[PDB]
Amino acid sequence: GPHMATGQDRVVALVDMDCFFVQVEQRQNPHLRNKPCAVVQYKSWKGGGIIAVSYEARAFGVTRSMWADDAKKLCPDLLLAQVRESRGKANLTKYREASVEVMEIMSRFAVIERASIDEAYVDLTSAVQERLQKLQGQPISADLLPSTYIEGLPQGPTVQKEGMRKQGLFQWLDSLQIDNLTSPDLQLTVGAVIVEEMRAAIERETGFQCSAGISHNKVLAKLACGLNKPNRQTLVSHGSVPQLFSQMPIRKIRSLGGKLGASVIEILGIEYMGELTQFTESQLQSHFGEKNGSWLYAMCRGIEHDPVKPRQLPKTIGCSKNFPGKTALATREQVQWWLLQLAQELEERLTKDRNDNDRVATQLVVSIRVQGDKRLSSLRRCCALTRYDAHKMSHDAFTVIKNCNTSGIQTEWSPPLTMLFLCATKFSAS
DNA sequence: ATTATGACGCT
DNA sequence: AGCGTCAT
Numbered sequence: 001g002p003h004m005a006t007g008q009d010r011v012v013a014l015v016d017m018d019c020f021f022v023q024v025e026q027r028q029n030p031h032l033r034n035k036p037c038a039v040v041q042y043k044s045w046k047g048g049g050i051i052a053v054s055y056e057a058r059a060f061g062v063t064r065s066m067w068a069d070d071a072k073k074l075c076p077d078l079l080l081a082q083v084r085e086s087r088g089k090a091n092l093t094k095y096r097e098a099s100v101e102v103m104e105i106m107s108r109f110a111v112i113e114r115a116s117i118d119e120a121y122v123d124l125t126s127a128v129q130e131r132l133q134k135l136q137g138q139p140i141s142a143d144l145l146p147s148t149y150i151e152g153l154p155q156g157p158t159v160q161k162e163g164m165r166k167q168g169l170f171q172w173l174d175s176l177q178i179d180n181l182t183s184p185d186l187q188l189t190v191g192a193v194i195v196e197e198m199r200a201a202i203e204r205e206t207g208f209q210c211s212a213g214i215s216h217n218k219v220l221a222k223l224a225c226g227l228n229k230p231n232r233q234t235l236v237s238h239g240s241v242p243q244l245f246s247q248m249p250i251r252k253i254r255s256l257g258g259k260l261g262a263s264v265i266e267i268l269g270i271e272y273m274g275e276l277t278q279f280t281e282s283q284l285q286s287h288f289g290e291k292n293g294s295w296l297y298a299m300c301r302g303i304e305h306d307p308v309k310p311r312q313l314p315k316t317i318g319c320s321k322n323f324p325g326k327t328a329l330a331t332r333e334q335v336q337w338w339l340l341q342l343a344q345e346l347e348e349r350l351t352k353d354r355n356d357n358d359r360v361a362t363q364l365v366v367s368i369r370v371q372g373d374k375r376l377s378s379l380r381r382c383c384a385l386t387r388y389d390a391h392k393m394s395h396d397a398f399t400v401i402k403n404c405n406t407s408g409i410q411t412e413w414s415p416p417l418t419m420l421f422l423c424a425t426k427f428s429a430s
Numbered sequence: 431a432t433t434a435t436g437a438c439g440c441t
Numbered sequence: 442a443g444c445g446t447c448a449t
């Protein structure tokens with residue numbers, strides 16, 4: 001009853017760029033705009049691997065992970081942009097720099113948590129309170145929410161998409177109590193107004209379009225964001241949760257897309273998030289652990305407490321390359337040449353990071369994969385990172401892995417290496 | 431022969 | 442520490 005928390009204390013948004021790497025390339029090259037197009041890495045093996053796909057191309061069935069040669073079978077007119085190659089490897093700098101553009105704009109509105117290269121969470125609780133003060137009881141016009149969907153509406157007693165959106169929005173606004181500064185639904189609505197403003201600023205100042213979710217926590221905001229893409233935002237209210245979750249496959253919720261989610265389904269014999277409500281917190285903890293059980297018990301009721309962390313910069317800076325099939329590294333000279341290539345890219349990124357961000361990495365992590373292993377990483381070792389010098393870092397990495405070599409011969413490497421990874425970590429202010 | 435990342439949890 | 446899970 002009155003002591004039952006409802007997880008309505010915060011306003012949280014998740015902003016996610018639409019087909020991000022494609023937009024970066026389309027901004028640069030106007031010939032790619034409004035076309036079926038994809039971004040690919042490498043080119044020799046099956047036309048290259050697709051890592052991003054425009055919405056026009058998705059209509060033909062083109063997807064991430066598809067080889068370009070295969071994508072061309074579905075979409076013969078597909079246009080392609082290639083990821084830059086430097087020092088023999090894919091180099092993602094252009095996309096990292098575009099990400100900084102967007103993150104810096106978002107940061108003007110609120111503190112953000114960088115969740116990935118193209119998405120950020122925002123805690124809008126304080127901004128909403130402020131805006132509610134300015135509004136002074138004044139209602140919120142539909143004109144302020146030109147790209148907002150209200151999940152679950154319209155409902156109750158037009159056949160076009162935009163018409164439906166407006167009907168739902170009208171029902172929502174019609175029902176609002178703008179006289180109460182503490183009404184969670186009103187807070188979410190004001191949150192959505194601010195997010196329209198943020199999204200407009202991003203598009204004005206970068207050219208990039210995005211989608212967003214607005215709810216009371218990170219998990220619902222993320223879920224919401226995906227409900228209407230591209231170039232739209234979605235508000236998921238606390239009240240919308242029972243219906244939304246009643247047919248929502250468990251795997252759709254962030255963190256349940258893998259083995260844990262599969263075990264929830266298997267052990268409990270259920271399919272949808274809403275079905276979780278019928279178990280006690282102790283029952284869930286018994287199957288999935290203390291932490292997971294409490295989390296599931298709250299989450300299936302729309303409640304989640306993970307904070308939006310004040311962190312705009314990545315915590316690690318890493319460089320990685322696979323060496324598949326016949327290209328696996330089988331000589332010491334090969335291994336050393338590639339560690340150097342990786343170290344040179346890392347040095348470049350670290351030096352820029354130190355100048356931009358007033359910090360220095362203190363640990364170097366070296367990881368490899370050996371041919372045969374089904375695991376993505378076979379071995380990981382750390383050593384001190386005391387100088388931003390590529391030759392030193394590569395020599396140091398060779399030293400820490402050189403004992404993985406089975407070959408009785410000094411010059412040969414066995415089993416061959418199918419992955420190298422260097423990662424700078426443990427930053428300190430400088 | 432997906433690849434290149436990056437955060438966080440366990441013991 | 443080193444490994445695993447999950448995610449973009």
Ligand SMILES: Nc1ncnc2c1ncn2[C@H]1C[C@H](O)[C@@H](COP(=O)(O)OP(=O)(O)OP(=O)(O)O)O1
Nearest residue numbers: 016017018019020021022051052053117118229449
């Ligand atoms: N598995 C991956 N491997 C390499 N790069 C990836 C991978 N997944 C995502 N990326 C890169 C390319 C994407 O443009 C960018 C953001 O990913 P993501 O948000 O999942 O999709 P997207 O921005 O391309 O499309 P959407 O409009 O569906 O969000 O990160």
Ligand SMILES: [Ca+2]
Nearest residue numbers: 016017018019
């Ligand atoms: Ca995206």
Ligand code: NA
Nearest residue numbers: 016116118119
């Ligand atoms: Na994303």
